[PDB]
Amino acid sequence: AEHWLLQPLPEPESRYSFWVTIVTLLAFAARFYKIWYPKEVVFDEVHFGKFASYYLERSYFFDVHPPFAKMMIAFIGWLCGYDGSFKFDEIGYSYETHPAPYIAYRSFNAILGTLTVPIMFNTLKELNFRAITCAFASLLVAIDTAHVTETRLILLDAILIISIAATMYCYVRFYKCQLRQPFTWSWYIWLHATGLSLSFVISTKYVGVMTYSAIGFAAVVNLWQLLDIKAGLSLRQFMRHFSKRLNGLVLIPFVIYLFWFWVHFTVLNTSGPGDAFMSAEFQETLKDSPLSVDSKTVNYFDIITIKHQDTDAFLHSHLARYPQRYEDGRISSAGQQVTGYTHPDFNNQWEVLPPHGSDVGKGQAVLLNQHIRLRHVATDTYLLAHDVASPFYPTNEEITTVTLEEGDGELYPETLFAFQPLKKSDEGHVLKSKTVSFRLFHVDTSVALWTHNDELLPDWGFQQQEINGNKKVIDPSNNWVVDEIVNLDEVRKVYIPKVVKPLPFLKKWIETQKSMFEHNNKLSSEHPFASEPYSWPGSLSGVSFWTNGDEKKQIYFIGNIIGWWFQVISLAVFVGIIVADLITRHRGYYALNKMTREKLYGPLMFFFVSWCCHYFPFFLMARQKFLHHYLPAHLIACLFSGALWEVIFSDCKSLDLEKDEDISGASYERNPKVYVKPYTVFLVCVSCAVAWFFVYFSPLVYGDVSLSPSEVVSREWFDIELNFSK
Amino acid sequence: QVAEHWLLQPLPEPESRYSFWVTIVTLLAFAARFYKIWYPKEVVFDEVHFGKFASYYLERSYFFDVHPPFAKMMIAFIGWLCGYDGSFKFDEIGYSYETHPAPYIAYRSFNAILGTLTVPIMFNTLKELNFRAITCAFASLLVAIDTAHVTETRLILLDAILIISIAATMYCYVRFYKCQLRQPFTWSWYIWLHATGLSLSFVISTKYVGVMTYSAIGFAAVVNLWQLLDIKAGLSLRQFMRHFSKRLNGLVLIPFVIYLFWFWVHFTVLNTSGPGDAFMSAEFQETLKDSPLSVDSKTVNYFDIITIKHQDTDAFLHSHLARYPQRYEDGRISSAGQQVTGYTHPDFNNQWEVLPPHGSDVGKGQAVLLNQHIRLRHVATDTYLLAHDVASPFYPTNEEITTVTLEEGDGELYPETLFAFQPLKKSDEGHVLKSKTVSFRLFHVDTSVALWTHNDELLPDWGFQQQEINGNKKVIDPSNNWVVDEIVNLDEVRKVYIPKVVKPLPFLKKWIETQKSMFEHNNKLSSEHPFASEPYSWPGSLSGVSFWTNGDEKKQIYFIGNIIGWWFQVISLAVFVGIIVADLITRHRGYYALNKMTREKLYGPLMFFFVSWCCHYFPFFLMARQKFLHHYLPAHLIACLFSGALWEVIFSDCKSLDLEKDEDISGASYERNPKVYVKPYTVFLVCVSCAVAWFFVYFSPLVYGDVSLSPSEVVSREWFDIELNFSK
């Protein structure tokens, strides 16, 4: 496409500036519309918000994707002065109870999604297409429902898609500089800008290898043309092209990719949820967490305080006794009261004793799920649970205490407790203060100790929380932690500051990289929205991102079906045109003008092959896949479709059907007329249909409007299952 | 046209030299396949499947398989020629052919003939591509004495029929292409076109992997149609359309009719109900005649007295007046209830009356439906079958099965007497229960267990050494399967065998149903295999498959390629890619290193074999189902032709006359008869042949299974991921 791409622009710059401004303002309006809504965690915000928090805390985490895009999200949190306190644990968590800077994160993605549109516009402008063609192709991304939904939420895809758009643009700029004058300062700038953008693509997600393949193919095709003796280059000049492109497109981008891992390991210098994925040698490079520095192994004969996780109350006892009858007339034991108390005192102190007749001595660690006894230090009594109903809950057991003589006698079984782990995998691990949650499980009656703060004991229980034996052992509200060890040896009191051992960066990176590829290939899950590659170009199914049951509102991830089908038709029509051109030429019939062919076999073939690189490799992947994996291919299909329809509405005819205009010295029409009037009417009709669809699906893009069940069902077609259709 | 000047040359040697070498390599191939063909006198590997299918064809019993019928019908046809009746079932590996005489020597001999006849077809393929007689001999020798091709083609396997049909396809297509170059639309051109189509039909009618052979020939046929579409070919569009329509007919339409013909034969031979029925619709099964034996198989009605038989242990559900001991040997407490046991002999204590639930309007003579609640009354003790939350004698997690009195079972224990004949498939819920044909789980309604029994351990003296009957919590377990064997109280009107009225089904409907079932089960889900292997390991022959083992004699058959031969082919493929890349680079630079005739060999026959190898290798990387080393034998077969051809080219005078001039330009002078350096070429081929033959002899104990190896000799043959038996 040398003669086509070296032409002046087909229109004045003011027309391009007008249309790029309009489509950028539409893209801005579509992404920033109600950006504060929903005020809850949506979809994969549970992952990328959580990773932003771990960067701010400097806590080591593992993920299957490279660090760059997550560090960009974390960097916005850092600019907002966010500390990482909020964890984004589940979908539907309110941003009002724990203020994460979610508007700033969503706004950052909305900016990147908006800036993608003028990069797409300028890509076609640089390929010498008309301003209306550039506007239309960019509009197909500006008001696509899937591109809008993804680029307003705290997702990696806004950073991926802008980096792909920037890669395509920078490569087109590089290629025009290559056609005009190679080895100019501008040629080096655009080569290294293509490499930089390619680095950001692969540093966001490994699917970025498809963008390397697309640009790599185009760069190899152009290197082949420069290797031809007809190019007039010496082998030394060719080798200069090769070595400079290898440096700009492979070596420098690889150094920038490694730089993001170097930043990642320098920021994440504290032990965290990622430790389980790494070797002990890697974990030795991490500092102890600030929380772990105040943690200690619990031993037999340690005096401990036991704290409830949900109510912050301590397990407490005092010389007061349960009333012989509760207010409902049930009979209590008239035993010593065990209560939940929110203030630290001497009545919160329990000594951990081993079972009677055990060989277990002072300084041995308590293991999870081992039988223990708890002695209340202030009253010198054993903790006890029995078949007596609790004050407020007739089905739950009263928790009391017994004398040492009675508890070493007949009531011995009723004094047996265990620090039962929350997970069966954790049985037999060493109990530690502050870090190990457990259920305080009674061995004989099979209940867990529980407390609540919705109702307080009457005046006879000092308005303290009730402690009772809950029969629903698995209930997450039965969770306790050892808060303090009161009798900690001064040496034990002295924190043991792990000596951080250094690991060479390349060893650290190779280990993390192997773990990334192994976990990415080795993973199960399910996700009731996974989609095979054959369904993507049709947008035949989508993904539920968020639902509110009370308001009957939902966010649903789906493509603009009119826009996507228009692109499928465009791809099919182009294959038909190329096959027809090849057949007719093989018959000595030259239907198409040289300039039409330069558009078809240059920019359109470049986008078609680039789309193939972002679509067909997914048929070879056996892992879970989803519709969002097609957004890179759809982005290229928007450029392609805009370009194709300008060619179809151009004067494509050869001057002489019996003569090949590609023969050196043949006359050909250099400025094929575009039929602007019917072309503009056609583009307006398609744009109005795409805009109508975007408005019709806007309640599902924004989640901001409740739909009646009949309106929900009216948007269910193919394999689109929506919530609230009943 | 591609390689037109090369392929139109006279043969490089007299026909007597070709006749000499083809005879020698065919005699070697015969000797390698027929060596001890009677050994082992036992069922080996997949002989359990293909021997069994041969038996079902002879009995006319309907069976289902994931592969098309042609190759199995060829095996069955040898049995039919031997007067074999199909009595022997080939149920397991190691079953003796002496106790039940199947014509296994005749079946193995048929495959050994086909494996032997593959070798002269391969030889003649290269002869027709104008290669030297020694080149044809060497490429055919690489198949004649390959350990994998030998092992497969002497056992009762489909692969002998597949491989000869692929070899015949390649040969027939080369013959067709030479007729196309000389004079199109001759009688010989039609013969070879339809012979290519016929051979292609046999490939896809043997295994669906035969689509790779259609792709290889289809690509070559499209490339040649593309050359004939060229205005420079001098053909009118009418003459081109005549080529197109005749090739479409000979390579697609006729082969498809022959493929359908084998299914028509299959459904005409298999006209009786059989083990395949479970894979087909009731409408398909209505086209099958009943099985004679099942003349007494009949609808089970309420108030029928039945015997219930376990599928895996052949034991009947049995009960008697003896009681469980108050404590088992491990100290667990039993119910001290009446014993329910598995008994292998038919008696009066196997008799259970099928009763409807209490308060049902269901009368005598109404059919029992699958998954309906029922009660079972033991006829001899007048007690209801019961399951409860008491642990079984041997399995602490499984329930004890007992019986209760009528008064107690009609009282508080009523829920614990409720059973269902639970179908194996959810699709079969609400169907009529029938004796002998309908497998079910005997499901307890209250505790959600299935009745189960085993024969690895028998009850102690208090349980008369009978099988335990227990309530298995793993309901879905295939070992929980039961059948109604007999209806003891059957009325004379029902007793009279009811000759099912056979209903006709249109052939295309029958074929479409079977074909959908074939593809669904082939890509059903498969699993993992102690011998499954991935495509990347095949060209190296890095792992093999155990086919047979005898523990007493320490003998084994192991399926593996001739590693020297396979690595020589990998090197050959790599060298050719290097030659093509070097030719392309040098030409771009205006340097014409290679003579026109050398290029016609490289871009004609060698490229045809290279693309054909690619079609038989690379598509397996896109397949997510289980795969095995034998799937590469079609690609290896093509790689043998390729490697023989390539090394003749390397040992030829490949130089252009003028390195600055393209000899492909019209009117350029080129050397028409490039000299082969026959002396160093023959020494090279003899050295490689001696190495391949040495390897074949060294592995021959594992090909034939006929020699016991010491543990050190076994370990000396273990390399890479080759695990052999008796290494300890």
PDB file of N, CA and C in Angstrom, chain A residues 213-281:
ATOM      1  N   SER A 213       1.818 -11.232  17.914  1.00  0.00           N
ATOM      2  CA  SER A 213       1.711 -12.049  16.703  1.00  0.00           C
ATOM      3  C   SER A 213       1.215 -11.223  15.515  1.00  0.00           C
ATOM      4  N   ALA A 214       0.194 -10.382  15.714  1.00  0.00           N
ATOM      5  CA  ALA A 214      -0.339  -9.492  14.682  1.00  0.00           C
ATOM      6  C   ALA A 214       0.711  -8.487  14.167  1.00  0.00           C
ATOM      7  N   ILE A 215       1.378  -7.766  15.076  1.00  0.00           N
ATOM      8  CA  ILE A 215       2.435  -6.806  14.711  1.00  0.00           C
ATOM      9  C   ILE A 215       3.676  -7.522  14.172  1.00  0.00           C
ATOM     10  N   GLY A 216       4.034  -8.662  14.761  1.00  0.00           N
ATOM     11  CA  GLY A 216       5.153  -9.495  14.331  1.00  0.00           C
ATOM     12  C   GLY A 216       4.980  -9.987  12.900  1.00  0.00           C
ATOM     13  N   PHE A 217       3.785 -10.472  12.547  1.00  0.00           N
ATOM     14  CA  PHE A 217       3.458 -10.868  11.181  1.00  0.00           C
ATOM     15  C   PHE A 217       3.639  -9.700  10.207  1.00  0.00           C
ATOM     16  N   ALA A 218       3.049  -8.538  10.505  1.00  0.00           N
ATOM     17  CA  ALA A 218       3.181  -7.358   9.655  1.00  0.00           C
ATOM     18  C   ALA A 218       4.646  -6.887   9.522  1.00  0.00           C
ATOM     19  N   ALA A 219       5.420  -6.947  10.610  1.00  0.00           N
ATOM     20  CA  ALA A 219       6.830  -6.579  10.615  1.00  0.00           C
ATOM     21  C   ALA A 219       7.687  -7.553   9.792  1.00  0.00           C
ATOM     22  N   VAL A 220       7.384  -8.857   9.841  1.00  0.00           N
ATOM     23  CA  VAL A 220       8.036  -9.907   9.042  1.00  0.00           C
ATOM     24  C   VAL A 220       7.697  -9.756   7.565  1.00  0.00           C
ATOM     25  N   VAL A 221       6.432  -9.511   7.213  1.00  0.00           N
ATOM     26  CA  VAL A 221       6.016  -9.225   5.825  1.00  0.00           C
ATOM     27  C   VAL A 221       6.798  -8.037   5.274  1.00  0.00           C
ATOM     28  N   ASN A 222       6.922  -6.958   6.047  1.00  0.00           N
ATOM     29  CA  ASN A 222       7.692  -5.813   5.584  1.00  0.00           C
ATOM     30  C   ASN A 222       9.203  -6.103   5.510  1.00  0.00           C
ATOM     31  N   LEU A 223       9.778  -6.851   6.459  1.00  0.00           N
ATOM     32  CA  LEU A 223      11.176  -7.295   6.357  1.00  0.00           C
ATOM     33  C   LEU A 223      11.405  -8.179   5.123  1.00  0.00           C
ATOM     34  N   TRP A 224      10.415  -8.999   4.767  1.00  0.00           N
ATOM     35  CA  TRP A 224      10.533  -9.815   3.533  1.00  0.00           C
ATOM     36  C   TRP A 224      10.656  -8.886   2.323  1.00  0.00           C
ATOM     37  N   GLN A 225       9.751  -7.908   2.207  1.00  0.00           N
ATOM     38  CA  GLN A 225       9.836  -6.944   1.097  1.00  0.00           C
ATOM     39  C   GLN A 225      11.197  -6.233   1.038  1.00  0.00           C
ATOM     40  N   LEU A 226      11.783  -5.888   2.188  1.00  0.00           N
ATOM     41  CA  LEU A 226      13.103  -5.245   2.253  1.00  0.00           C
ATOM     42  C   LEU A 226      14.268  -6.196   1.935  1.00  0.00           C
ATOM     43  N   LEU A 227      14.059  -7.509   2.039  1.00  0.00           N
ATOM     44  CA  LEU A 227      15.044  -8.530   1.678  1.00  0.00           C
ATOM     45  C   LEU A 227      15.101  -8.770   0.160  1.00  0.00           C
ATOM     46  N   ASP A 228      14.027  -8.446  -0.570  1.00  0.00           N
ATOM     47  CA  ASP A 228      13.979  -8.576  -2.026  1.00  0.00           C
ATOM     48  C   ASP A 228      15.077  -7.721  -2.684  1.00  0.00           C
ATOM     49  N   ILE A 229      15.798  -8.304  -3.643  1.00  0.00           N
ATOM     50  CA  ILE A 229      16.821  -7.624  -4.450  1.00  0.00           C
ATOM     51  C   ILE A 229      16.233  -6.377  -5.132  1.00  0.00           C
ATOM     52  N   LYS A 230      14.948  -6.415  -5.508  1.00  0.00           N
ATOM     53  CA  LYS A 230      14.232  -5.278  -6.108  1.00  0.00           C
ATOM     54  C   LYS A 230      14.052  -4.094  -5.150  1.00  0.00           C
ATOM     55  N   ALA A 231      14.187  -4.285  -3.834  1.00  0.00           N
ATOM     56  CA  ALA A 231      14.167  -3.187  -2.864  1.00  0.00           C
ATOM     57  C   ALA A 231      15.428  -2.306  -2.958  1.00  0.00           C
ATOM     58  N   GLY A 232      16.491  -2.797  -3.609  1.00  0.00           N
ATOM     59  CA  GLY A 232      17.730  -2.050  -3.828  1.00  0.00           C
ATOM     60  C   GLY A 232      18.591  -1.883  -2.574  1.00  0.00           C
ATOM     61  N   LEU A 233      18.350  -2.686  -1.533  1.00  0.00           N
ATOM     62  CA  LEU A 233      19.119  -2.664  -0.293  1.00  0.00           C
ATOM     63  C   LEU A 233      20.284  -3.655  -0.350  1.00  0.00           C
ATOM     64  N   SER A 234      21.447  -3.225   0.139  1.00  0.00           N
ATOM     65  CA  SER A 234      22.555  -4.138   0.458  1.00  0.00           C
ATOM     66  C   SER A 234      22.216  -5.000   1.673  1.00  0.00           C
ATOM     67  N   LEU A 235      22.872  -6.155   1.808  1.00  0.00           N
ATOM     68  CA  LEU A 235      22.651  -7.034   2.960  1.00  0.00           C
ATOM     69  C   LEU A 235      22.974  -6.331   4.290  1.00  0.00           C
ATOM     70  N   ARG A 236      23.957  -5.421   4.306  1.00  0.00           N
ATOM     71  CA  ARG A 236      24.285  -4.602   5.490  1.00  0.00           C
ATOM     72  C   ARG A 236      23.144  -3.657   5.886  1.00  0.00           C
ATOM     73  N   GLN A 237      22.484  -3.027   4.913  1.00  0.00           N
ATOM     74  CA  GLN A 237      21.330  -2.155   5.166  1.00  0.00           C
ATOM     75  C   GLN A 237      20.124  -2.956   5.658  1.00  0.00           C
ATOM     76  N   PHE A 238      19.871  -4.123   5.065  1.00  0.00           N
ATOM     77  CA  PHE A 238      18.852  -5.055   5.551  1.00  0.00           C
ATOM     78  C   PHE A 238      19.121  -5.481   7.003  1.00  0.00           C
ATOM     79  N   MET A 239      20.349  -5.903   7.320  1.00  0.00           N
ATOM     80  CA  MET A 239      20.714  -6.292   8.689  1.00  0.00           C
ATOM     81  C   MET A 239      20.557  -5.134   9.680  1.00  0.00           C
ATOM     82  N   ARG A 240      20.808  -3.888   9.256  1.00  0.00           N
ATOM     83  CA  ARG A 240      20.509  -2.704  10.072  1.00  0.00           C
ATOM     84  C   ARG A 240      19.009  -2.580  10.362  1.00  0.00           C
ATOM     85  N   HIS A 241      18.129  -2.792   9.382  1.00  0.00           N
ATOM     86  CA  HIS A 241      16.679  -2.828   9.617  1.00  0.00           C
ATOM     87  C   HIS A 241      16.302  -3.930  10.611  1.00  0.00           C
ATOM     88  N   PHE A 242      16.792  -5.150  10.380  1.00  0.00           N
ATOM     89  CA  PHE A 242      16.518  -6.309  11.222  1.00  0.00           C
ATOM     90  C   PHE A 242      16.930  -6.065  12.680  1.00  0.00           C
ATOM     91  N   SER A 243      18.193  -5.697  12.932  1.00  0.00           N
ATOM     92  CA  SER A 243      18.704  -5.497  14.294  1.00  0.00           C
ATOM     93  C   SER A 243      17.990  -4.368  15.038  1.00  0.00           C
ATOM     94  N   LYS A 244      17.629  -3.271  14.354  1.00  0.00           N
ATOM     95  CA  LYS A 244      16.897  -2.167  14.994  1.00  0.00           C
ATOM     96  C   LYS A 244      15.461  -2.560  15.336  1.00  0.00           C
ATOM     97  N   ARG A 245      14.762  -3.290  14.460  1.00  0.00           N
ATOM     98  CA  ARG A 245      13.409  -3.796  14.751  1.00  0.00           C
ATOM     99  C   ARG A 245      13.407  -4.851  15.851  1.00  0.00           C
ATOM    100  N   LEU A 246      14.368  -5.775  15.852  1.00  0.00           N
ATOM    101  CA  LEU A 246      14.547  -6.744  16.939  1.00  0.00           C
ATOM    102  C   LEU A 246      14.730  -6.035  18.290  1.00  0.00           C
ATOM    103  N   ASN A 247      15.559  -4.991  18.326  1.00  0.00           N
ATOM    104  CA  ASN A 247      15.758  -4.210  19.539  1.00  0.00           C
ATOM    105  C   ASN A 247      14.483  -3.469  19.986  1.00  0.00           C
ATOM    106  N   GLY A 248      13.811  -2.772  19.068  1.00  0.00           N
ATOM    107  CA  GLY A 248      12.631  -1.963  19.377  1.00  0.00           C
ATOM    108  C   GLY A 248      11.356  -2.761  19.658  1.00  0.00           C
ATOM    109  N   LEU A 249      11.170  -3.927  19.031  1.00  0.00           N
ATOM    110  CA  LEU A 249       9.943  -4.732  19.125  1.00  0.00           C
ATOM    111  C   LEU A 249      10.068  -5.962  20.032  1.00  0.00           C
ATOM    112  N   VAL A 250      11.281  -6.362  20.442  1.00  0.00           N
ATOM    113  CA  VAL A 250      11.490  -7.558  21.287  1.00  0.00           C
ATOM    114  C   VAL A 250      12.325  -7.246  22.526  1.00  0.00           C
ATOM    115  N   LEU A 251      13.562  -6.757  22.361  1.00  0.00           N
ATOM    116  CA  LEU A 251      14.491  -6.625  23.493  1.00  0.00           C
ATOM    117  C   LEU A 251      14.066  -5.548  24.500  1.00  0.00           C
ATOM    118  N   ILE A 252      13.767  -4.329  24.036  1.00  0.00           N
ATOM    119  CA  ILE A 252      13.327  -3.240  24.922  1.00  0.00           C
ATOM    120  C   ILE A 252      11.982  -3.563  25.593  1.00  0.00           C
ATOM    121  N   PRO A 253      10.951  -4.036  24.865  1.00  0.00           N
ATOM    122  CA  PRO A 253       9.697  -4.442  25.492  1.00  0.00           C
ATOM    123  C   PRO A 253       9.886  -5.531  26.551  1.00  0.00           C
ATOM    124  N   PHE A 254      10.782  -6.496  26.322  1.00  0.00           N
ATOM    125  CA  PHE A 254      11.093  -7.513  27.323  1.00  0.00           C
ATOM    126  C   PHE A 254      11.737  -6.924  28.591  1.00  0.00           C
ATOM    127  N   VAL A 255      12.633  -5.942  28.459  1.00  0.00           N
ATOM    128  CA  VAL A 255      13.213  -5.238  29.619  1.00  0.00           C
ATOM    129  C   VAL A 255      12.138  -4.483  30.408  1.00  0.00           C
ATOM    130  N   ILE A 256      11.200  -3.821  29.726  1.00  0.00           N
ATOM    131  CA  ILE A 256      10.091  -3.102  30.371  1.00  0.00           C
ATOM    132  C   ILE A 256       9.133  -4.084  31.065  1.00  0.00           C
ATOM    133  N   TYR A 257       8.872  -5.240  30.455  1.00  0.00           N
ATOM    134  CA  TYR A 257       8.120  -6.321  31.088  1.00  0.00           C
ATOM    135  C   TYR A 257       8.785  -6.798  32.391  1.00  0.00           C
ATOM    136  N   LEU A 258      10.104  -7.033  32.387  1.00  0.00           N
ATOM    137  CA  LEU A 258      10.854  -7.392  33.599  1.00  0.00           C
ATOM    138  C   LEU A 258      10.850  -6.270  34.645  1.00  0.00           C
ATOM    139  N   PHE A 259      10.902  -5.010  34.216  1.00  0.00           N
ATOM    140  CA  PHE A 259      10.839  -3.852  35.108  1.00  0.00           C
ATOM    141  C   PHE A 259       9.570  -3.861  35.966  1.00  0.00           C
ATOM    142  N   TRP A 260       8.409  -4.205  35.404  1.00  0.00           N
ATOM    143  CA  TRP A 260       7.168  -4.283  36.179  1.00  0.00           C
ATOM    144  C   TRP A 260       7.189  -5.376  37.250  1.00  0.00           C
ATOM    145  N   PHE A 261       7.847  -6.510  36.999  1.00  0.00           N
ATOM    146  CA  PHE A 261       8.070  -7.527  38.035  1.00  0.00           C
ATOM    147  C   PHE A 261       9.053  -7.065  39.106  1.00  0.00           C
ATOM    148  N   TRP A 262      10.086  -6.319  38.716  1.00  0.00           N
ATOM    149  CA  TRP A 262      11.015  -5.734  39.675  1.00  0.00           C
ATOM    150  C   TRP A 262      10.304  -4.753  40.615  1.00  0.00           C
ATOM    151  N   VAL A 263       9.438  -3.880  40.081  1.00  0.00           N
ATOM    152  CA  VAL A 263       8.589  -2.996  40.898  1.00  0.00           C
ATOM    153  C   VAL A 263       7.664  -3.825  41.789  1.00  0.00           C
ATOM    154  N   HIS A 264       6.969  -4.819  41.232  1.00  0.00           N
ATOM    155  CA  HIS A 264       6.062  -5.694  41.978  1.00  0.00           C
ATOM    156  C   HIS A 264       6.731  -6.331  43.208  1.00  0.00           C
ATOM    157  N   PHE A 265       7.910  -6.941  43.054  1.00  0.00           N
ATOM    158  CA  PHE A 265       8.644  -7.539  44.179  1.00  0.00           C
ATOM    159  C   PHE A 265       9.243  -6.519  45.153  1.00  0.00           C
ATOM    160  N   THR A 266       9.485  -5.285  44.709  1.00  0.00           N
ATOM    161  CA  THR A 266      10.013  -4.212  45.566  1.00  0.00           C
ATOM    162  C   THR A 266       8.906  -3.592  46.421  1.00  0.00           C
ATOM    163  N   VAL A 267       7.702  -3.470  45.859  1.00  0.00           N
ATOM    164  CA  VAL A 267       6.523  -2.978  46.575  1.00  0.00           C
ATOM    165  C   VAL A 267       6.035  -4.041  47.555  1.00  0.00           C
ATOM    166  N   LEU A 268       5.833  -5.282  47.095  1.00  0.00           N
ATOM    167  CA  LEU A 268       5.357  -6.412  47.903  1.00  0.00           C
ATOM    168  C   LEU A 268       6.509  -7.102  48.642  1.00  0.00           C
ATOM    169  N   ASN A 269       6.868  -6.554  49.798  1.00  0.00           N
ATOM    170  CA  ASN A 269       8.001  -7.007  50.601  1.00  0.00           C
ATOM    171  C   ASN A 269       7.594  -7.644  51.937  1.00  0.00           C
ATOM    172  N   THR A 270       6.296  -7.818  52.162  1.00  0.00           N
ATOM    173  CA  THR A 270       5.711  -8.391  53.372  1.00  0.00           C
ATOM    174  C   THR A 270       4.966  -9.679  53.035  1.00  0.00           C
ATOM    175  N   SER A 271       5.001 -10.648  53.945  1.00  0.00           N
ATOM    176  CA  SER A 271       4.284 -11.926  53.843  1.00  0.00           C
ATOM    177  C   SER A 271       2.777 -11.693  53.684  1.00  0.00           C
ATOM    178  N   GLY A 272       2.114 -12.501  52.859  1.00  0.00           N
ATOM    179  CA  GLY A 272       0.706 -12.305  52.515  1.00  0.00           C
ATOM    180  C   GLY A 272       0.042 -13.544  51.899  1.00  0.00           C
ATOM    181  N   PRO A 273      -1.185 -13.422  51.357  1.00  0.00           N
ATOM    182  CA  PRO A 273      -1.944 -14.568  50.839  1.00  0.00           C
ATOM    183  C   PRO A 273      -1.277 -15.276  49.649  1.00  0.00           C
ATOM    184  N   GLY A 274      -0.297 -14.642  48.996  1.00  0.00           N
ATOM    185  CA  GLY A 274       0.470 -15.230  47.899  1.00  0.00           C
ATOM    186  C   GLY A 274       1.530 -16.240  48.333  1.00  0.00           C
ATOM    187  N   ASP A 275       1.860 -16.305  49.625  1.00  0.00           N
ATOM    188  CA  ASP A 275       2.979 -17.105  50.129  1.00  0.00           C
ATOM    189  C   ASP A 275       2.801 -18.594  49.819  1.00  0.00           C
ATOM    190  N   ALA A 276       1.566 -19.101  49.915  1.00  0.00           N
ATOM    191  CA  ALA A 276       1.220 -20.503  49.663  1.00  0.00           C
ATOM    192  C   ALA A 276       1.560 -20.995  48.242  1.00  0.00           C
ATOM    193  N   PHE A 277       1.763 -20.084  47.288  1.00  0.00           N
ATOM    194  CA  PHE A 277       2.076 -20.403  45.892  1.00  0.00           C
ATOM    195  C   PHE A 277       3.580 -20.431  45.595  1.00  0.00           C
ATOM    196  N   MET A 278       4.408 -20.009  46.552  1.00  0.00           N
ATOM    197  CA  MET A 278       5.845 -19.824  46.382  1.00  0.00           C
ATOM    198  C   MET A 278       6.641 -20.762  47.285  1.00  0.00           C
ATOM    199  N   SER A 279       7.901 -20.987  46.924  1.00  0.00           N
ATOM    200  CA  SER A 279       8.828 -21.780  47.722  1.00  0.00           C
ATOM    201  C   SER A 279       9.175 -21.102  49.050  1.00  0.00           C
ATOM    202  N   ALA A 280       9.630 -21.902  50.017  1.00  0.00           N
ATOM    203  CA  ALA A 280      10.154 -21.384  51.279  1.00  0.00           C
ATOM    204  C   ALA A 280      11.313 -20.390  51.065  1.00  0.00           C
ATOM    205  N   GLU A 281      12.176 -20.620  50.065  1.00  0.00           N
ATOM    206  CA  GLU A 281      13.285 -19.712  49.734  1.00  0.00           C
ATOM    207  C   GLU A 281      12.780 -18.337  49.266  1.00  0.00           C
TER     208      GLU A 281
END
